[PDB]
Design a protein around this ligand. Structure first.
Ligand SMILES: Nc1ncnc2c1ncn2[C@@H]1O[C@H](COP(=O)(O)OP(=O)(O)NP(=O)(O)O)[C@@H](O)[C@H]1O
Ligand SMILES: Nc1ncnc2c1ncn2[C@@H]1O[C@H](COP(=O)(O)OP(=O)(O)NP(=O)(O)O)[C@@H](O)[C@H]1O
Ligand code: SF4
Ligand code: SF4
Ligand SMILES: [Mg+2]
Ligand SMILES: [Mg+2]
Ligand SMILES: [Mg+2]
Ligand SMILES: [Mg+2]
Ligand SMILES: [Mg+2]
Ligand SMILES: [Mg+2]
Ligand SMILES: [Mg+2]
Ligand SMILES: [Mg+2]
Ligand SMILES: [Mg+2]
Ligand SMILES: [Mg+2]
Ligand SMILES: [Mg+2]
Ligand SMILES: [Mg+2]
Ligand SMILES: [Mg+2]
Ligand SMILES: [Mg+2]
Ligand SMILES: [Mg+2]
Ligand SMILES: [Mg+2]
Ligand SMILES: [Mg+2]
Lengths: 178, 96, 241, 582, 126
RNA sequence: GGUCGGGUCGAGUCUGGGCUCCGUGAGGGGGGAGAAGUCGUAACAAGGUAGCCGUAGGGGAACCUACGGCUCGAUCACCUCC
RNA sequence: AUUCCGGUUGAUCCUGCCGGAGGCCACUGCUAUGGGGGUCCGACUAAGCCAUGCGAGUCAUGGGGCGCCUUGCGCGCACCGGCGGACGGCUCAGUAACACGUCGGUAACCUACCCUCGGGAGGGGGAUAACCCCGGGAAACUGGGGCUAAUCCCCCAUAGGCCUGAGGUACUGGAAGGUCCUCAGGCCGAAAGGGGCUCUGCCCGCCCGAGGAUGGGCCGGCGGCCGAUUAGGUAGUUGGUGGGGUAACGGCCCACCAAGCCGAAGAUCGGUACGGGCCAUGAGAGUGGGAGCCCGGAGAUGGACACUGAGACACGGGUCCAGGCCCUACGGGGCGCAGCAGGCGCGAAACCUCCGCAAUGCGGGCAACCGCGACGGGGGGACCCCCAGUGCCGUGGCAACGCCACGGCUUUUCCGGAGUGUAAAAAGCUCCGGGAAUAAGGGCUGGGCAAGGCCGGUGGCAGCCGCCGCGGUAAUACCGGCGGCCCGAGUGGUGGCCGCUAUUAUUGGGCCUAAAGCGUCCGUAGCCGGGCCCGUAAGUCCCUGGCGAAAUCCCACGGCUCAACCGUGGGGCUUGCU
C-alpha cells in the first residue's frame, strides 16, 4: 500500500470549455509555453498557495501562525508579494504573476532575449546564469534576490558584445510586461 | 482470446436497416462460445475461420450491448496477432 | 518465525539515532549490552556518522580494533556495542570526551566535555537485590551491578543516583531522590529538561509513580520517576546540555 | 506449432461423454482434428495437420489425458547465421560454461560444426543476410544484454587462446610433418607429454611418422596436440571417430583429467563416451540442411534419453515422431597373405566368402584392416598370397574422407552412375531417398557435413555396380539412425547384386546388425597383425572383446548398448560366462 | 498426550481451525508414573526448553519424610488414598497429593516426583 | 541397532451410510427479443357488456360468469354543502 | 470548480434510470528524441511443474597431519573440532483467529552471542577422523584393519542447581508461592588455566552464580467483513476438587464431582479474505482497496511425525503416506525454485540463465580478512514522477494565428574525442570539434463537446453510433482528400474503483396520484421521553502525565543546476488506549 509518486499538476474538469480554452491560448502565446501541462503546473502552484491561505484564515494559533509566517516569507522570497503583505493578498494573486516569475519571462525582460521563444532557447542551450549557476530549466521560478544576478554565461558567445545576436538584442533594449 | 467458429451477420433492431457482421468465437480459458462484432468495412473478409482473435468489450452502457446491435457484447481487436484496424486500413497484412 | 533477529532495517530502526533512514537498506543491529535499544546507539554510528572520523565501516572497525575509543574508561572493540545515556566516549589521541545524552527532540547527541568530568558517570540505581553472602546488589540502569553491604544498604535506595569513577568503579557522591534534588529527564515529552523536584505521586497498583519538577524559569512540569534522573542535590554538577 | 497428444492410458471413451471432440472448435466448424478410430481401442486420435493447439480438449477431458506439445519450426527466432539465401540457418548458441565440459549431441546436418566455428571465431554469424560482410563489431552490439556477449567480447579481444580439433582429420593430416615425438615437443606448452602418452597409449606410435598413420592413431595425435596446447577454451569436433572402444574410453579419460578448469566443448556421436566425458549436453534439433535450434543444458543421461525418445521436457518439443530403435537383425577366396610395411608384420589366414554374405572386420586401432583393404583393391601387393578370382570388378571407399571435389552432388552421383539418381531404380528409392540426398542434390560438396559427405561416398561406392565392395570407416561422422539406415542400404544392395562386402568399422552394433560373418585381427598394435579365418558373429565379437577386456550390456526393451565399468559385477559375470556383448 | 496448545473449541462451542502447525515449544511429554519399586531407584533425565534439566522418577524407594523440620529417608512400602485416581492406588503410583504407607507410618506427599525426581512427604499425626 | 510384543500421535487404504459441489445431459416448462405471420378485438372515449381488486369455477386465446368491494367511471335526474 | 450536460412529449413540468465529462489501477492499438529520481515489472489465472548454474559459510592464534619452498621464517591443502546455518531472501494457499493494531500484564516463563559484578578453573582417563594397508558398489554411498591429537568425549570431587519441611524477617515491590539468613532430609551435578605474543606480564578465551539486555512464549481489555432463503449451538462442552504435563498459567490432558457456557446487541453454520501502517477517490461527510516499502503472521508439492540445538517440528537438514518426476547395471538411488536469473505451462496479462562484495549490513574470525543472487551496480521494459528537445533571429512575400524565400546565430539533443566519474565499466558532468542537421504523433471533427454550410465516392447497401442518433442520389454524422480542434512524447480502446449520485441520503432522499404506510389493533426487547430540588460524577468538557514505530502527508529551510529525490526541524496521521 505504498507511496506512489503523484503528479504536481492538475488537469481541468472539462477539457473543452471555450472560455478556458481562449484564456489559456492567450496566456500560452504571450508567455511562449510548450505545454498546457506547464501552464497547469503553475496554476496548481497558485492553487496550493491559495488553499493554504484559506486554511490559515480559518485556523487557530501556535501553529497555523508559523505557517502563516512561512507562507508570507516564501512568497516574498519568490517575489510574488511585498514584505508588508497578507493572506488577502495571496488570494488576490494570479497565475500571470507566477509566469512572470519564470526565468523565460525574466530573460525576455532584462533585455536579454528579444522574444520569449529566444529566451527559451538561450536558457536551454546554456547561455543564462543565475547567481553564477547555469540553469537550463525555463520554468525555474526566480527568487526576487536572484533576479538582479541574471546574466549571460561566461562561456557563452552572447557574452561577447561583438556577437551578432547580442548586437540585435541590444539594438532592441526593451522590457516591462512580458 | 478465441477461435473463430463461424462468420455471421445480425440485423439491426427496428428503424435501422443493416446486417452487422460478426463471428461466433470459442474462448480458450473456458471453452465457451460468444459472438463478437467485427468493426470496419472489410473486416469480415480479413477474418477467416479457425483464426485466433482477441476479444474486447464493445463498450455499451452496462458493460453490454451497443447501439443498433441488439445482443452482441464483444468486439474483435486483433486477428492472428494483428490489429483489425490496421488490416482494414490496409497496413500490416495478416500472417495466416 | 523460527528464531531470533540478527538484522535491522534502517527504516525499522530506533527513532533516536540520527541515522539517515532511506539512504541504505540496513543498519547495525546493536548487540545486547549495557543499555537498551531505546536508550542506545552503536559505536559504529558514533565513530562514523557523529564524529566523522570515518566515512566507512571498515575504517571504523580498524580504529575500534586498534583501540582508540574508550567507553567509560574501557576499550571497546566491537562496532555493535551499545553506547547509552550519560555515557562517556573518550578519544585520548585527540583529547576529547563526549557525554552521550538525549536531545530535546528526543535523539541522542554527544555533548563535549573534559577529562575531569570524563572520569565520572552517574548511575540511577534502579533496583536492589539481596544476594548470597547476605550482600546487597544494586542493579543499575546501564545494566551494571555494584555490591555493597548491609551497613549502608539504607544509604542506598532504588531511584537514587550514584556518581561512579568508571575505570575503577568506586562510588563517590550518592545523590538521593528527594525534594529539591536537581534532576534531568531522559525520556518522554519533557526530555532534555531539568530542574528541582517538587512532588511525587504514587498511584496504587503497578501504575508508575510521577514526579513534579520545577525548571529554572519557574515553570512546573510532570514526568515519570523512572525518567527522572538525578544529577545533583541543588545543581546538576555534571554539565548536561 | 503446438498440437495435442493423448496418453491413451488415462483415456476412457466410455466414462467421458467425449468432451474433447464435442468442445473442439475444428470439429464444430466442420473440420476434423480429433476423431474416434478403431486403429486404437475405439479411442480418439489427433491429426496434427489440423489441430491448432488451443487446449480446449485438454481442459475438458476429465481424466487429464490430453496435453499440448511443441513441434519445431523454421519461423521464429533471432537467426544467428545463414550460409546461403536458401541453404541453412541457425537459431541460438550454447554458452560455454567456465569450468564444465559441454556436449553437443544433435543429428547430422543441424549445426554442430557451425556452432563450433562461431564459438571458435573461425567464422562470423551474419545473423540475416549471408552478405553484409560485417563481423566482430555489430555482432557484439547485437548480442548485447547476454552472457555470451562476455564470451565473444573476450574472444574477439583475443583474451583467450582457443584451440580447435576439427572434424576432418585428413585435412588436418595434410598440414604437419616430422614424427609424433618432435611434433609434440614442438607444440607442447604444458609439459604433460608423458601423461598423454600413458593415457592415449601412444608408446608404439611414439616414433612412427605422421604420414604413415592409421586413422585412429592420427586422431590420437591430433587430440594430444590439442590437449598439450595451452588455452582457455578447448573444442573437440567428433574426437571419437576412427577409434576403437578402449581407445575412445582412454580419450575421454584424458580429456576430463587434463582439462578441469577450462571451457570445453565436445561434439560426438558416441552415446557411450558422451555419457562419460560430458557433464552437460546441449541438443541440436531441427531439419537437416534446413534449420537448427539449440536446446537447454540437459545433463548427460537425461539429454541422451531425451534425444532417443524424441521429446525434450523443457521446451516441450516433440522433435521426432518416433524413438530411436537400436534394431537387432564360393565367389572369392585367398591364401594366407603375409605383408610387411617396413615393420608391422601382417598375416591373415584365408577364408571363403560364400555368395553375397557380408564380412565384417574387427580389431584394435593399429593392426591391418586398411592395409588389408588396400591389398584387396590392389593399391598394395602382398609380400605373399593373393586373391582368387583376381581381376574382378571392384569398388572402394577408404577412411581418407575429406572435401576435395568442386562440383555438386548431382554431378558426383552422375559421374558415379545413372542408378544413383534415376528414380527408375530401386537403388534410388532405397539408398538416396532413405539417406536424404534428394535434399542436397544442388549443394556443392566442399560445403557439406561430415555425415552427408560420408553418405555421399557410400552412395557412389554402392552405385558403382561391382562384385567386390570395400568400405572402411563408413559409420564415422554419422549418427545412430543413419548408421542403421546405411547398414540396411548396404545389406540390400549387396544381397541384390549377390556380391561380396568387406566392412571395416569399430561399431559392433553395425556388425551385429548386418554381418553374417566377421574376421578378427589380433596381435601387438603396430608390430603384428594376426587375423584369422572368417568366424561367426558372436564368436568373433567375443574374441575381439576378450581382447581389450571390454564388456557390453544391452537393454532388452530397446537394445541400447552400454559399456560396463571395469571390474563391475556384470563385467565379471559376462566374462566368466563368455557372453561379451549380450 | 503431546500437544498442550489451545483447544479446538470456543467457549461458545464453536470450532477452531488451526491457522498454524504445531510448534515444538507447545508440546508435552509422556507422564511419569512414579511407582514403588523393589529396589534400584529408577530415574531419567529430560533435556528441556533452554537446555534445562528435569529429573523424572519412575520407581521410588525411599521418600524423605518430614515432621516439623526433621527429615529422614524411610523406605516407601506402598500407596494409599490417591484423590487423583483410584486406579493409582491399585497400580501403586505416587503423585503429589498421595498417601504412602512407610516405615514411620503414613505420609502425604508434597513433591512432584515426575518433575523433581524425589519423593518428599509429611507425617500425618494420628 | 534388530526381532518379538505392550502403549501412544497417527496420515493413509478399503469400504458401506448421509449431505452438498462440479462437469455434463435425454425429456417437460415457462421467459425475453425479433420477425410478418395466424385466430380473434379483451383495454384506452359510456372502447360499443364501464373498468379494476379479491375469491371461485369455466373457456382456442385475448377472456367470461358469480359474490363482495373500489372509482383510478362517463352521461342525466334529485336533493345538500358551496 | 461544493458544477453540470444529452436522452421519455406534438410541446411542458416531474420522477427516475442510462450516457457523457474527471481522476487512479490493469491489459491493449497507433506512435515514440533525451536525461534525472523512485519503495515499479509472473501479484490478478496455475501455493502448477521445473533443465542448468549460483544463492552460508568462516576460523591455520583449537588439534593432529599431508605437501611445497635446499632448510629456516613461511605458503598451501583438506580432515577433526568450534561458531553460524532457526537470520536474511520468497510467497499469501490457509486463517474471521488474541492472527492483527493498540493499551497493559507475566509475582505464571525460556533466552546461545553481549554487558556488569562476584567467584572458580582441582584430579584422572579414553576413543576416533585425517593418515597408512585393502577395498566393495553402476551410482548414491560405504566396509574392515592399523595409528594419533585436541578448546573432542567420559569419570571423580568441590562449587552450584532443584524439591520438600521448619522459622527469621535483611531486600525489592502497589502487592510475596519471590530473593536473602539458619537448620533439616534428599536428587541432579560444571569447567579448556586452553591457545598466542614483545612471556613472569598482556591478549583472545573455559565454567558457575546474581542481574540486565536482546529475542521470544503465554494472558487480558478495547478495536476492525458479509449472510436469518443459516436459530438454537456445545459434551472436555462451562466450572470445580485433586493431579499430571509443560519453560511456564491454563480442561492442555486425566480421574472424580456438578450443570454449566454461548445466543436474536445474532450464537452456530456457511461465504469471502493474510492483518495493519497505508493507498485511490472525493469539497467534505464518505465510498473502495489492503501485490510492491516497513511491522507482524503464516507457509515451503499435500498430510503427519521426529532428531539436534539457546532457538526448528527446520525453503537450500531427517522419516513415512499420497501424488508426480529423474538416473539405474532393475539390485537400488534421488528431486519437488512460493531464493536470483532462467524455462515449460497457464493465461488479456510482467525482464538478464549479467557484474561485484567497492558501499550498507550479516556470519565467522584476536585481527587483517573471507563469503553472502541479501545488498549494490548495470542492462530489458510507453511502471510512476521531475526537467527538457524536435530550433531561434531578422528582412521580404503569402491563400498573413503560421508558412515560403534570402541572410545570420545557437547546439540542449545527434555524431566523434579527451578528462572526471565507476569496484571496474556505462551513464552523467566539464571541455574540444562538426553541423539546423538527427528527431511528432494519436484521437476527434452533427449535438452532448473545442473544431468543416468544402470536395470526391457509396447510396437502408457498406458502414458509423459511449447516449441521442446519421445513412434509402444534394450525407458537414460512413470511406477518402484538403482543412481544422484537443492533448501532445504521448494519444486512443477495453475492464475495474472513486466521483458524477441528495441513484443508499448521519450531514442529506423519498413513501395521495410517479417505486414505496404492514388490513387494523395490542404489546416484549430496543429507541425517544414533561417540570423542580438534592446528590453522584458514568458519559461529556478542560488541563496534564505516559503511549499510539519509521516511512508515507503538510510546511519551511538546506544539498544534488532547480525540480522530482534526499536531509534538518516543526506539525499532523494512526479508531485510539491509559
Ligand atoms: N560453408 C557452408 N556453406 C554452405 N552450407 C554449408 C556450409 N557448411 C555446412 N553447410 C550446410 O549446413 C548444414 C549443417 O551445417 P554443419 O554444421 O556442417 O552440420 P553438422 O552439424 O556438423 N553435421 P555432421 O558433421 O554430419 O555431424 C549442412 O547440411 C551443410 O550442407
Ligand atoms: N606405408 C606404411 N609404411 C609403414 N607402415 C605403415 C604404412 N602404412 C601404415 N603403416 C602402419 O601399419 C599399421 C596398420 O596400418 P593400418 O591398417 O592403416 O591401421 P589400422 O589397423 O586400420 N587402424 P585404424 O585405421 O585406426 O582403424 C600401422 O602401424 C601403420 O603405422
Ligand atoms: S481424452 Fe478425455 S474426452 Fe477424450 S476420450 Fe479420453 S477421457 Fe474422453
Ligand atoms: S488443441 Fe484444440 S484444435 Fe487441436 S485437437 Fe485439441 S481441441 Fe482440437
Ligand atoms: Mg559436423
Ligand atoms: Mg586404418
Ligand atoms: Mg371487458
Ligand atoms: Mg373492445
Ligand atoms: Mg368494455
Ligand atoms: Mg361462462
Ligand atoms: Mg436534456
Ligand atoms: Mg504464480
Ligand atoms: Mg510481488
Ligand atoms: Mg561430576
Ligand atoms: Mg486466500
Ligand atoms: Mg513449486
Ligand atoms: Mg505490462
Ligand atoms: Mg460525432
Ligand atoms: Mg437506484
Ligand atoms: Mg428519491
Ligand atoms: Mg509515523
Amino acid at each position: 500500500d505504498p507511496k506512489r509518486q503523484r503528479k504536481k499538476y492538475e488537469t481541468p474538469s472539462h477539457p473543452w470549455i471555450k472560455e478556458r480554452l481562449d484564456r489559456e491560448r492567450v496566456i500560452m502565446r504571450k508567455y511562449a509555453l510548450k505545454n498546457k501541462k506547464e501552464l497547469w503546473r503553475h496554476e496548481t502552484q497558485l492553487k496550493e498557495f491559495r488553499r493554504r491561505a484559506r486554511r490559515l484564515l480559518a485556523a487557530r494559533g501556535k501553529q497555523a501562525e508559523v505557517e502563516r509566517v512561512q507562507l508570507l516569507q516564501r512568497l516574498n522570497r519568490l517575489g510574488l508579494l511585498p514584505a508588508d503583505a497578507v493572506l488577502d493578498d495571496v488570494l488576490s494573486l494570479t497565475v500571470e504573476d507566477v509566469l512572470d516569475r519564470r526565468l523565460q519571462t525574466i530573460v525576455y525582460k532584462k533585455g536579454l532575449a528579444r522574444t520569449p521563444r529566444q529566451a527559451r532557447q538561450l536558457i536551454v542551450h546554456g547561455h543564462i546564469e543565475v547567481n553564477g549557476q547555469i540553469i537550463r530549466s525555463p520554468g525555474y521560478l526566480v527568487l526576487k534576490a536572484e533576479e538582479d544576478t541574471i546574466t549571460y554565461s561566461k562561456t557563452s558567445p552572447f557574452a561577447r558584445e561583438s556577437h551578432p545576436e547580442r548586437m540585435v538584442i541590444e539594438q532592441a533594449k526593451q522590457g516591462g510586461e512580458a | 482470446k478465441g477461435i473463430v467458429l463461424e462468420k455471421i451477420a445480425v440485423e439491426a433492431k427496428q428503424p435501422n436497416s443493416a446486417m452487422r457482421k460478426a463471428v461466433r468465437v470459442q474462448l480458450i480459458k473456458n471453452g465457451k462460445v460468444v459472438t463478437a462484432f467485427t468493426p470496419g468495412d472489410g473486416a469480415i473478409n480479413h477474418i477467416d475461420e479457425h483464426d485466433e482473435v482477441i476479444i474486447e468489450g464493445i463498450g455499451g452502457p452496462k458493460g453490454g450491448s451497443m447501439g443498433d446491435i441488439p445482443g452482441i457484447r464483444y468486439k474483435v481487436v486483433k486477428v492472428n496477432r494483428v490489429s483489425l484496424k490496421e488490416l482494414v486500413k490496409g497496413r500490416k497484412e495478416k500472417p495466416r | 518465525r523460527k528464531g531470533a533477529k540478527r538484522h535491522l532495517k534502517r527504516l525499522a530502526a530506533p527513532d533516536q539515532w540520527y541515522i539517515s533512514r532511506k539512504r541504505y537498506k540496513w543498519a547495525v543491529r546493536p548487540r545486547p549490552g549495557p543499555h537498551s535499544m531505546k536508550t542506545s546507539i552503536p559505536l559504529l554510528y558514533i565513530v562514523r556518522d557523529y564524529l566523522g572520523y570515518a566515512k566507512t565501516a571498515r575504517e571504523a572497525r580498524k580504529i575500534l580494533n586498534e583501540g582508540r575509543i574508550l567507553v567509560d574508561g574501557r576499550v571497546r572493540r566491537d562496532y555493535k556495542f551499545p553506547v547509552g545515556i550519560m555515557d562517556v566516549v573518550s578519544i585520548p589521541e585527540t583529547g576529547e570526551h563526549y557525554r552521550v545524552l538525549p536531545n530535546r527532540i528526543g535523539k541522542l547527541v554527544l555533548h563535549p566535555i573534559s577529562e575531569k568530568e570524563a572520569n565520572i558517570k552517574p548511575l540511577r540505581i534502579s533496583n536492589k537485590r539481596m544476594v548470597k553472602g547476605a550482600k546487597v546488589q544494586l542493579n543499575l540502569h546501564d545494566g551494571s551491578n555494584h555490591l555493597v553491604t548491609v551497613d549502608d544498604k539504607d544509604n542506598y535506595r532504588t531511584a537514587y543516583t550514584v556518581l561512579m569513577k568508571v575505570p575503577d568503579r568506586e562510588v563517590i557522591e550518592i545523590l538521593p531522590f528527594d525534594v529539591g534534588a536537581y534532576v534531568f529527564v531522559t525520556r518522554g515529552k519533557n526530555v532534555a529538561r531539568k530542574g528541582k523536584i517538587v512532588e511525587v505521586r504514587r498511584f496504587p497498583m503497578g501504575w508508575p509513580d510521577v514526579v513534579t519538577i520545577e525548571d529554572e524559569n519557574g515553570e512546573l512540569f510532570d514526568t515519570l520517576k523512572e525518567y527522572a534522573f538525578v544529577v545533583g542535590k541543588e545543581k546538576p554538577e555534571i554539565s548536561l546540555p | 506449432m503446438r498440437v495435442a497428444v493423448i496418453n491413451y492410458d488415462f483415456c476412457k471413451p466410455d466414462k467421458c461423454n467425449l468432451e474433447c471432440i464435442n468442445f473442439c472448435p475444428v470439429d464444430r466448424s466442420g473440420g476434423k482434428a480429433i476423431e474416434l478410430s478403431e486403429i486404437v481401442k475405439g479411442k480418439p486420435v489427433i491429426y496434427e495437420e489440423t489441430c491448432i493447439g488451443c487446449g480446449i480438449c485438454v481442459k475438458k477431458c476429465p481424466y487429464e489425458a490430453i496435453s499440448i506439445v511443441n513441434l519445431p519450426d523454421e519461423l521464429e527466432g533471432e537467426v544467428i547465421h545463414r550460409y546461403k539465401v536458401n541453404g541453412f540457418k541457425l537459431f541460438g548458441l550454447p554458452t560455454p560454461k567456465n569450468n564444465t565440459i559441454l556436449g553437443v549431441l544433435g543429428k547430422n546436418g543441424v549445426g554442430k560444426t557451425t556452432v563450433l566455428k562461431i564459438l571458435a571465431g573461425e567464422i562470423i554469424p551474419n545473423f540475416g543476410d549471408p552478405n553484409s560482410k560485417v563481423g566482430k563489431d555489430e555482432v557484439l552490439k547485437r548480442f548485447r544484454g547476454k552472457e555470451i556477449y562476455n564470451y565473444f567480447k573476450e574472444l574477439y579481444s583475443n583474451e583467450l587462446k582457443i584451440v580447435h580439433k576439427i572434424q576432418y582429420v585428413e585435412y588436418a593430416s595434410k598440414f604437419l610433418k616430422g614424427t609424433v615425438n618432435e611434433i609434440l615437443t614442438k607444440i607442447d606448452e604444458r609439459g604433460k607429454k608423458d601423461e598423454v602418452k600413458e593415457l592415449l597409449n601412444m608408446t608404439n606410435l611414439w616414433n612412427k611418422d605422421a604420414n604413415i598413420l592409421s586413422g585412429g592413431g592420427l586422431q590420437r595425435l591430433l587430440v594430444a596436440a590439442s590437449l598439450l596446447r595451452e588455452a582457455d577454451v578447448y573444442i573437440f569436433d567428433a574426437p571419437s571417430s576412427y577409434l576403437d572402444v578402449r581407445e575412445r574410453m582412454n580419450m575421454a579419460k584424458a580429456i576430463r583429467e587434463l582439462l578441469k578448469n577450462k571451457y570445453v566443448i565436445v561434439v560426438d556421436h558416441d552415446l557411450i563416451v558422451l555419457d562419460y566425458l560430458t557433464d552437460l549436453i546441449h541438443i541440436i534439433y531441427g531439419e537437416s540442411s534446413v534449420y537448427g535450434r539449440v536446446s537447454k543444458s540437459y545433463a548427460a543421461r537425461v539429454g541422451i534419453n531425451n534425444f532417443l525418445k524424441g521429446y525434450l521436457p523443457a521446451e516441450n518439443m516433440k522433435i521426432r515422431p518416433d524413438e530411436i530403435k537400436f534394431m537387432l537383425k564360393t565367389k572369392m577366396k585367398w591364401t594366407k597373405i603375409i605383408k610387411k610395411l617396413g615393420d608391422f608384420q601382417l598375416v591373415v589366414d584365408n577364408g571363403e566368402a560364400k555368395e553375397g554374405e557380408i564380412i565384417g572386420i574387427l580389431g584394435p586401432n593399429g593392426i591391418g584392416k586398411t592395409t588389408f583393404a588396400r591389398i584387396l583393391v590392389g593399391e598394395i601387393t602382398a609380400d605373399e598370397g593373393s586373391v582368387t578370382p583376381e581381376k574382378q570388378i571392384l569398388s572402394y571407399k577408404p577412411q581418407r574422407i575429406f572435401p576435395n571435389y568442386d562440383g555438386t552432388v548431382q554431378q558426383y552421383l552422375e559421374n558415379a552412375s545413372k542408378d544413383a539418381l534415376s528414380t527408375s531404380s530401386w537403388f534410388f528409392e532405397e539408398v538416396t531417398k532413405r539417406l536424404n540426398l534428394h535434399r542436397l542434390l544442388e549443394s556443392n560438396v566442399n560445403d557439406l557435413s561430415g555425415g552427408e559427405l560420408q553418405k555421399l561416398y557410400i552412395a557412389a561406392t554402392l552405385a558403382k555396380e561391382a562384385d567386390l565392395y570395400v568400405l572402411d570407416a563408413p559409420s564415422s561422422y554419422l549418427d545412430v539412425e543413419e548408421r542403421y539406415i546405411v547398414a540396411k542400404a548396404i545389406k540390400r544392395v549387396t544381397r541384390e547384386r549377390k556380391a561380396v562386402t568387406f566392412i571395416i568399422d569399430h561399431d559392433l552394433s553395425i556388425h551385429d546388425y548386418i554381418a553374417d560373418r566377421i574376421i578378427v585381427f589380433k596381435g601387438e598394435p603396430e608390430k603384428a597383425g594376426l587375423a584369422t579365418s572368417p568366424v561367426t558373429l558372436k564368436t568373433g565379437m567375443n574374441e575381439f572383446l576378450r581382447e581389450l577386456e571390454v564388456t557390453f550390456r544391452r537393454d532388452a526393451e530397446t537394445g541400447r548398448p552400454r559399456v560396463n565399468k571395469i571390474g563391475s559385477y556384470l563385467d565379471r559375470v559376462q566374462k566368466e560366462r563368455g557372453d561379451y556383448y549380450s | 498426550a503431546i500437544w498442550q496448545g489451545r483447544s479446538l473449541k470456543k467457549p461458545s462451542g464453536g470450532r477452531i481451525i488451526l491457522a498454524r502447525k504445531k510448534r515444538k515449544r507447545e508440546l508435552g511429554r509422556e507422564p511419569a508414573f512414579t511407582r514403588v519399586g523393589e529396589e534400584k531407584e529408577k530415574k531419567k533425565i529430560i533435556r528441556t526448553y533452554g537446555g534445562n534439566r528435569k529429573v523424572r522418577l519412575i520407581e521410588a524407594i525411599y521418600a524423605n519424610v518430614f515432621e516439623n523440620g526433621k527429615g529422614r529417608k524411610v523406605k516407601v512400602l506402598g500407596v494409599v488414598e490417591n484423590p487423583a485416581n483410584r486406579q493409582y492406588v491399585r497400580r501403586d503410583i505416587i503423585t503429589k497429593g498421595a498417601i504412602i504407607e512407610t516405615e514411620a507410618g503414613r505420609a502425604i506427599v508434597t513433591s512432584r516426583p515426575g518433575q523433581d525426581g524425589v519423593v518428599n512427604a509429611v507425617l500425618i499425626k494420628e
